[PDB]
TrEMBL record, chain B:
It comes from Human enterovirus 71. Belongs to the picornaviruses polyprotein family. This is Genome polyprotein. Cysteine protease that cleaves viral polyprotein and specific host proteins. It is responsible for the autocatalytic cleavage between the P1 and P2 regions, which is the first cleavage occurring in the polyprotein. Also cleaves the host translation initiation factor EIF4G1, in order to shut down the capped cellular mRNA translation. Inhibits the host nucleus-cytoplasm protein and RNA trafficking by cleaving host members of the nuclear pores. Counteracts stress granule formation probably by antagonizing its assembly or promoting its dissassembly. The chain holds residues 638 to 862 of 2193 of the full protein. It is found in: Host cytoplasmic vesicle membrane; Host nucleus; Virion.
Amino acid sequence: STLLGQLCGYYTQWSGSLEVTFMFTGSFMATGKMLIAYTPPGGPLPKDRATAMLGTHVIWDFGLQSSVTLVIPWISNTHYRAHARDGVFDYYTTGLVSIWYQTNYVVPIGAPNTAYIIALAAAQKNFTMKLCKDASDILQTGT
Amino acid sequence: HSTAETTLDSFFSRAGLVGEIDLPLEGTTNPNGYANWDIDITGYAQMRRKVELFTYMRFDAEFTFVACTPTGGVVPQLLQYMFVPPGAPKPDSRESLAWQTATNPSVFVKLSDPPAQVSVPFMSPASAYQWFYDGYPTKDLEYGACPNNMMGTFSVRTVGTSKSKYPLVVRIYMRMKHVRAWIPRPMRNQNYLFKANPNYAGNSIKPTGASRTAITTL
Amino acid sequence: VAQLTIGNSTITTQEAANIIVGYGEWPSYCSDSDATAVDKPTRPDVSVNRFYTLDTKLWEKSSKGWYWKFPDVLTETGVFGQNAQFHYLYRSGFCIHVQCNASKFHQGALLVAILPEYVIGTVAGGTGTEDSHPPYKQTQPGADGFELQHPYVLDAGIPISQLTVCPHQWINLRTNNCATIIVPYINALPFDSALNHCNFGLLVVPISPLDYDQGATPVIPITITLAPMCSEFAGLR
Amino acid sequence: VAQLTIGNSTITTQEAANIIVGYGEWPSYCSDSDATAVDKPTRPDVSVNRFYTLDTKLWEKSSKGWYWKFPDVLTETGVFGQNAQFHYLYRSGFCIHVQCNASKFHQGALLVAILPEYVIGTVAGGTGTEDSHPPYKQTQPGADGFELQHPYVLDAGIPISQLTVCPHQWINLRTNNCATIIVPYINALPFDSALNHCNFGLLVVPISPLDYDQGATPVIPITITLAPMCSEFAGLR
Amino acid sequence: VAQLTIGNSTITTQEAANIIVGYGEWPSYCSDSDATAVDKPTRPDVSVNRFYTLDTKLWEKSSKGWYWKFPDVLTETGVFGQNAQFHYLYRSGFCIHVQCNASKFHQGALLVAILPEYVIGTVAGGTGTEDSHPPYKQTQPGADGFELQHPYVLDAGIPISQLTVCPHQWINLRTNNCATIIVPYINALPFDSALNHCNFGLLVVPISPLDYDQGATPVIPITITLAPMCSEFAGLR
C-alpha cells in the first residue's frame, strides 16, 4: 500500500533502515499502553507479551504522546532464492513487528469504547535500490 | 524538654528482667541443679514490640544475675554461671566436660556477694542483628528465621560435685547499651502468636486502637 | 511528554515528575571491601541495566492491594534473571516506577512503598493455632506479585496506617498517576544471596478505593516498570 | 486565542499552529517574463486578498470525504470570482486552512491534501464499459465541493494509501483540528485559464472514521477558510 | 614454562614458540561500515573472550586425521555458543592452538591448517552415482570434530599434497608439539550467519604416521585450545 513498497517492485534488490510510525486516532479521553516490539530475522514472533518485551520494544502510551515512531534497524532483500520459477532475491531478512496490549483500553463514560490506529511507513535516509525490474500487473490496454 | 530522653540509647537502656532460672531442690523442672538459658532479649515482654520498631540493630549488653531462694532468702551457696559462645556446645549433664572448657567464660560468685554482672559484646557475624529476614538461609519450614543473631547461652549451676542444699531462683537482668537502629518499620498492632514468626490471628484482627460511635460525635 | 531510553527498552513516561529517593541514598557499587576481598565482582552494565515492565495488574473497586519481593521478582524474566540464577553473591540497588492509566472521571489513591525485609505471615491456620510459615508463593511471588489478604495489617500484624514511615509515594488519581522510588541496597551484609533472601518488598495498596460513575472502564491498569541500578555479582556456576 | 485579520474578514483561528508550505515554496507574483511580455498583468491586492469561508461541511460517521477544485471553487462567490470571470489569463497562489470544531469526547482523523491536476473518473458506466468523462459537476464542484464515491482510489484509480506524497496535513481530533497548507501556483504554463483548467484539487478524507459515544452531536463541522496569495490577471472582457 | 591467562581459563602452554598469523592479518573489529549502518553491533569482550579447550582427540597409529568447522565448533559449548545462537549476524576472528603431549620415544608429524569455506563431499554413494550432499554431521561436526575418510583428497577431491598453500603449521614430534594459527575473519560479506555458513575449517592430519616401539602409550592426545579474537554480533532474538 505504501509508495515505498510499490517502488521497490520496480527494483530487484535493496537495503536500508525503515521507519514505521503509529498514530492513535481514538478519543482524547482515551488512555493506555500498547507495547510495540520488533524481532529481527529469525526469532519467531514472541510467544506472549512478556517474552516479547525482553527484546527491542517500545512501550507506547497514548494517554501522553498521541503518536510514536519505531525504527527498523536494517532489512536486506539481497539473499537470492528461486521459488517456483520466479527466482527473485527473496527477503529472508523479514523482521517482525508485533504490537501488544500493555494495559487494557481505558475510557471514561461518554467516550468511544473503541479506537483505531493508523500506520505510516517509509524508508530512512540510508536506503538503496539496485537493478530495475518493470514488473507491473497494471498494464495499458487499448480502449 | 531536652530531646535527650528521645535518643536511642535512652529508649533502649534500663536493666530489664529477661531470664528466671529455677533450681528447686526436688521436683520436675531442672532436676539436675542446673539449666541452660539461651540469651533471648525478648525475655522482657514489651521489648519485642520495641526493638521490632527497626529492621537492623546493633548493641551490647550488661547482664546481671540476682539469685536467691524462692522465699527471697540469702544463703551460703556458691554458684557458677557459664557462657556458651554461639558456636560451642552446651552442657548436658551436671558435669559434662563443658563446664570445664575455658573457651566458655564462667563466673563464680556466692549468694552472699552482690549480684554478678558481665558484658556481652555485639556477637553476630553480620553487620547487625536483624529482626526480619525475608527469605531462607541458603522437609521443614525455615522461613523468616535469621541464623546469626544468636547472642550465646548462659548455663547456671550450683558449684560442686553434689546437689545444692537449698532451693534457688536465679533472675537474669539485661540492659543493652550503645544502640544503633536502622530502617524504621510500622509498629506491631496485632497480638503476637509465636516467638518465631510474625503470624497473627487470621480472623481476630482488631483495629490499631479503640473505636467510637460516629465520626461526627466526639 | 518525554520518553526515557536506557536500554533496548523505551518507556514513554512523563518528562520528570517527583521521585522519592529511598532513605536518601543513590544506589552505588562499592568502595573496595566486601564478602569478597580477592574476588573482584563483575558489575553487569550490559543487558542487566535496561527497563523491565512487569505484567500490568488490574485495579478493581475491590483490589486489596499487591506486593512484590526483590530481588526475586526479576530473577524470573530477564537477563538480570540470568545473572541472579547463575551467580552466588549479589548486591544491587533499584528504581521502581509505578504508572496508572486512568481518566479524569475515575478516582482513587494508591500508597506505593518499599519495605525492607518484608516477612509475610498467613492466617496461621484460620483463627491462630498453626506455626505454618507462609507458602513459597508468598515468600517469592515471582514477577506477577501477590495480593494482600489483610491489607490493614499488611499481612504481618503491622498497621498500614503507618507504612508511610518507609520510602513511599502517593498516587492520587485526581492529582497524578506515575510515582517513582529509587531504592538503595539495604542489607546487613555487603553481598547477600539473590535467590533465597529477598532484600525487601514493594507494596502498592489502594488506600482510597477505586471508583467511577457506572459506564467507565472499571479496571484501571497499574504498570510497574523497574530498572536495576548498579548490579553486582560474584562467582558463576 | 489570536484572530488573524487580513481583509474585511476576521477569522478567530488559533495563535499559530503548524502549517505545511506546499512543495516548499511561498506563492509569489512573477519575475519579468510570461505568456504576456507587452502586457503588464495587474495584481489584485484590493478585495482579492481577504478571507473566504466556504459553507462548512458536516462530517458524519459515514462521510466518504470531500474535494474542491481550484481555482474554480472561488470563481463562484467573491470579488475573486469577479476577477476569474472577467479576465482571460490567470496565475495565483493560495493558502487553505481547514478547521474542525469538535469535543474531547469525539474522535477521528482527517487527511487533508493538495493534489495538482486532480482528474476525476466516475464509474465508467457501472462495471467498466463507457468512456463517460465525469459530469460538469465533478470537474468543477463550485464552492460546495463534492463527495468521493470511492475514497480508496480517490475517484481516479490512485490509492489514497499514498496520498501523503502530496502537500498534506493530518487532523487527528484527539490531537488538533485546524490544519494549514500554503499552495504555490503549480502549472506547466506561467499564465493559464482560471475558468476551464483547475490547477489542482483539495481533498479531505476521513482516514480514521468519525465516532462518539451515543449522545454527542453526531456531526462535526469542518470549516474551510482560504486566502488567495498573489493573484494575477491579464486582459479584461 | 609460562601459562597464558586471558579469561577464567588458564592454559599452561609454552612460553612463546612460533605462531603462524593467517594470511598475514590480525583479526580486528571493523572500520565504520557494514551489513548494518544504523545498527551499532555490540562487541562481546566479556566471557566471549576466554580460552576454550576442546575434548582432546586421541592419535593412533591409524588416525586418518580430523577437522572442525568454524564458527560451528563453538556455537555448541560456551557463552560464545550463547551469542552465536541468540544473534542474527556475526563476524569474528580467531586463534587456534593445537598441542601434543608425547614422549621423545614416539614419532610423527601433523600438518595443521585452516581452509576457508571447507566444503565436504562424501563418497557420492559408493562408486560415484548419487548427488547425496554430505550429512548434517559432516557440514557442522560440533565441538568434537569429524574424521577424514579419504585424507589424501581431504574429502573434497583436492590433494592434501598441496594443503600447505593455506595458513598452516607443522607439528613434527621430534621437533615440537604445540603449533598456533591466528585466523582473521575471511568472508565475502562483512557480517555473515554464525549458524548456517561456516567461515572455514580447521584440518589436522597425520602426514607422517604416529609410531612408537611397543610398550609406550600408543595414543598421543592432541589438545586443541582456541580463543575468539574480536567477536561481533547484531540484533538478538
